[PDB]
Design an enzyme around this catalytic site. Structure first.
Site, mmCIF file in Angstrom:
data_model
loop_
_atom_site.group_PDB
_atom_site.id
_atom_site.type_symbol
_atom_site.label_atom_id
_atom_site.label_comp_id
_atom_site.label_asym_id
_atom_site.label_seq_id
_atom_site.Cartn_x
_atom_site.Cartn_y
_atom_site.Cartn_z
ATOM 1 N N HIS B 41 152.385 -65.549 91.789
ATOM 2 C CA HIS B 41 153.216 -66.665 91.333
ATOM 3 C C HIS B 41 154.589 -66.215 90.786
ATOM 4 O O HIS B 41 155.402 -67.081 90.451
ATOM 5 C CB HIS B 41 152.494 -67.618 90.371
ATOM 6 C CG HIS B 41 152.302 -67.096 88.986
ATOM 7 N ND1 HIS B 41 151.056 -66.723 88.537
ATOM 8 C CD2 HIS B 41 153.187 -66.986 87.969
ATOM 9 C CE1 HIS B 41 151.223 -66.358 87.275
ATOM 10 N NE2 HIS B 41 152.489 -66.488 86.892
ATOM 11 N N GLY B 143 155.682 -65.511 79.914
ATOM 12 C CA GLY B 143 156.182 -64.171 80.183
ATOM 13 C C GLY B 143 155.095 -63.111 80.162
ATOM 14 O O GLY B 143 155.337 -61.986 80.606
ATOM 15 N N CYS B 145 152.273 -63.065 81.884
ATOM 16 C CA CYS B 145 151.583 -62.869 83.154
ATOM 17 C C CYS B 145 151.820 -61.492 83.728
ATOM 18 O O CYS B 145 152.874 -60.908 83.517
ATOM 19 C CB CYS B 145 151.910 -63.975 84.143
ATOM 20 S SG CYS B 145 151.539 -65.625 83.505
HETATM 21 C C1 LIG Z 1 153.652 -70.865 80.346
HETATM 22 N N1 LIG Z 1 152.724 -70.147 79.474
HETATM 23 C C2 LIG Z 1 152.805 -70.191 78.092
HETATM 24 O O1 LIG Z 1 153.659 -70.775 77.440
HETATM 25 N N2 LIG Z 1 151.764 -69.444 77.624
HETATM 26 C C3 LIG Z 1 151.035 -68.922 78.685
HETATM 27 C C4 LIG Z 1 149.940 -68.067 78.766
HETATM 28 N N3 LIG Z 1 149.442 -67.629 79.928
HETATM 29 C C5 LIG Z 1 150.034 -68.038 81.053
HETATM 30 C C6 LIG Z 1 151.117 -68.911 81.079
HETATM 31 N N4 LIG Z 1 151.630 -69.368 82.316
HETATM 32 C C7 LIG Z 1 151.018 -70.203 83.185
HETATM 33 O O2 LIG Z 1 149.867 -70.608 83.041
HETATM 34 C C8 LIG Z 1 151.897 -70.641 84.358
HETATM 35 C C9 LIG Z 1 152.762 -71.866 83.934
HETATM 36 C C10 LIG Z 1 152.640 -73.016 84.909
HETATM 37 O O3 LIG Z 1 151.282 -73.281 85.290
HETATM 38 C C11 LIG Z 1 150.672 -72.209 85.887
HETATM 39 C C12 LIG Z 1 149.745 -72.498 86.877
HETATM 40 C C13 LIG Z 1 149.100 -71.461 87.525
HETATM 41 C C14 LIG Z 1 149.407 -70.160 87.184
HETATM 42 CL CL1 LIG Z 1 148.638 -68.855 88.033
HETATM 43 C C15 LIG Z 1 150.325 -69.863 86.200
HETATM 44 C C16 LIG Z 1 150.965 -70.897 85.524
HETATM 45 C C17 LIG Z 1 151.631 -69.358 79.856
#
Ligand SMILES: Cn1c(=O)[nH]c2cncc(NC(=O)[C@@H]3CCOc4ccc(Cl)cc43)c21
Ligand SMILES: Cn1c(=O)[nH]c2cncc(NC(=O)[C@@H]3CCOc4ccc(Cl)cc43)c21
Lengths: 304, 304
Positions: B41, B143, B145
């Site tokens: 992603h 960030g 990921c």
């Molecule tokens: C954005 N974000 C945070 O603020 N805290 C997070 C902690 N872990 C991960 C994320 N990010 C996500 O989950 C992104 C944001 C959009 O939705 C999805 C859908 C699928 C997948 Cl694989 C990734 C994501 C986090």
């Protein structure tokens, strides 16, 4: 989201751990520049620990009696001195992995990471706090002495603890990197009992702010309190008194959540009086006090 | 003595973290040999996440669109491929700090350390477990990921997890290093709910053995049980069924303490039925399940 008991990345400290042996005693040492720091009880036998006269025992030791091994290579000891309860062994080689560092003496309530070591080799890393009775609740087996506690500010490691001793109750005592023990403990195998292990109020409040930031909000109530009223309750529950300095420190967490510090105090007051009723906060059934306000901000903001 | 939630020393993994940016998305990557692994992603915008066709989105990306930075130096990307939900970016330079490593797919109940990173830089290290519903309860902000989970056996790092996603409930999902998600999760911003988060029974029993080894013995009772009787209670309390394989795994802890596995099961059965009554075990007011029997042996023996 999610909130964990998080330690600092340990790599910078792993590069400093060495094995120090004096006679039949082997423990850990911290190699920074051309000096290896280690507990002075490395010179003692188990029998000497009962009533050691360190200056006298040290007279019988020369530079060649301190065996310092970094990885599987031997370091040449060209000097040795005692500073309070630590020995400083000057070696002929500066540690090539010496990070930027400081020696700091922490106050009770402050947290730090510990890199538990055996034979100069890292076994694990965990987070703990300097308790209000100057003990730490660590995880240390025989051979762990000389393991260190530290904090990292970007690329500078502030060393705050060196492990020396386990009390009969299973709690731990040690020194700063100038060899001064935290609290009243001495490096002697004699009965030493710890004082009251009170709860670090400002850290509990910081962790309740972390809980609100992460969605655990059930404990928020419709009340407020004053510092004096709160402290009457805190005294009763063996919680440290909350001061205006602690309120100031919680200011940024209050701003992030919109919950006034005294309102969070009232929530904590009700939790103390009512208990949890089988509920949890951030996966805990007790009020966690080993996250400082700075730890909460750092973890909730992602400082690297 | 003392028993802590301990993570592996993170140094070997810190030396592998890099920053990967594709367009306006920046996350972490794992650099081992001449390959950088990262969540696929990284190629998506926030809008693409709603219904991404990864093969189609990847057609619009070339080697020069993946910016890999190790420290403050840029790595040259000479190839890229998608393997399940991870991208493998071949670079022209082998990571000089590549430790001995393996890619392992863990089973639920297994624990691992996570090195949480932002912009390829380590922020902290913590211990967690693969839950029985294939989520992990981590600490991950935007960030994070690409941060990885791992175990260390002496000098070999077994990478088991790469962080990809946070569910609406604040729990986390991710893949092994071959890019296969743990559980049924998909890398799409769509409603995905987790199943029952049952308690890892064998880990609770291991932690009760750690408690006995460290002096917390109040919960030991005068009873015993059978696997079938215990499991009737475990089912009722959303605890995983205990098998003879789990009993075999607890054998060394039973030998160390002299407490038969089924006697410890009976103690756990009474703790479930009676509760803690305001008491704690190893500083916890709940039954901890993120220490495996192997973790208990390792921590209680000092493996480095
Ligand atoms: C954005 N974000 C945070 O603020 N805290 C997070 C902690 N872990 C991960 C994320 N990010 C996500 O989950 C992104 C944001 C959009 O939705 C999805 C859908 C699928 C997948 Cl694989 C990734 C994501 C986090
Ligand atoms: C021996 N030992 C363990 O088995 N688990 C320990 C965890 N931490 C420390 C120790 N070691 C000690 O406490 C030694 C043993 C003899 O008594 C004293 C007295 C004073 C001082 Cl400074 C050190 C010591 C441990």
């Amino acid at each position: 989201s999610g909130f964990r008991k998080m330690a600092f990345p340990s790599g910078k400290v792993e590069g400093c751990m060495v094995q120090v042996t004096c006679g039949t005693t082997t423990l850990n040492g911290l190699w920074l520049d051309d000096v290896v720091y280690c507990p002075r009880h490395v010179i003692c036998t188990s029998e000497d620990m009962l009533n050691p006269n360190y200056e006298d025992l040290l007279i019988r030791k020369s530079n060649h009696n301190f065996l310092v091994q970094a990885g599987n290579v031997q370091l040449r000891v060209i000097g040795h001195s005692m500073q309070n309860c630590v020995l400083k062994l000057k070696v002929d080689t500066a540690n090539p992995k010496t990070p930027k560092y400081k020696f700091v003496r922490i106050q009770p309530g402050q947290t730090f990471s510990v890199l538990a070591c055996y034979n100069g080799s890292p076994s694990g890393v965990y987070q703990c706090a300097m308790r209000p009775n100057f003990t730490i609740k660590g995880s240390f087996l025989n051979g762990s002495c000389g393991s260190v506690g530290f904090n990292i500010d970007y690329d500078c490691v502030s060393f705050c603890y060196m492990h020396h001793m386990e009390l009969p109750t299973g709690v731990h005592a040690g020194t700063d990197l100038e060899g001064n023990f935290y609290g009243p403990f001495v490096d002697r195998q004699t009965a030493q009992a710890a004082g009251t292990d009170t709860t670090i109020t400002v850290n509990v409040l910081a962790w309740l702010y972390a809980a609100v930031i992460n969605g655990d909000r059930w404990f928020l109530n419709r009340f407020t309190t004053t510092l004096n009223d709160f402290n009457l309750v805190a005294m009763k529950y063996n919680y440290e008194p909350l001061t205006q300095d602690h309120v100031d420190i919680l200011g940024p967490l209050s701003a992030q959540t919109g919950i006034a510090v005294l309102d969070m105090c009232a929530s904590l007051k009700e939790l103390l009086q009512n208990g949890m009723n089988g509920r949890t906060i951030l996966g805990s059934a007790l009020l966690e006090d080993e996250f400082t306000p700075f730890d909460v901000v750092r973890q909730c903001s992602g400082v690297t």
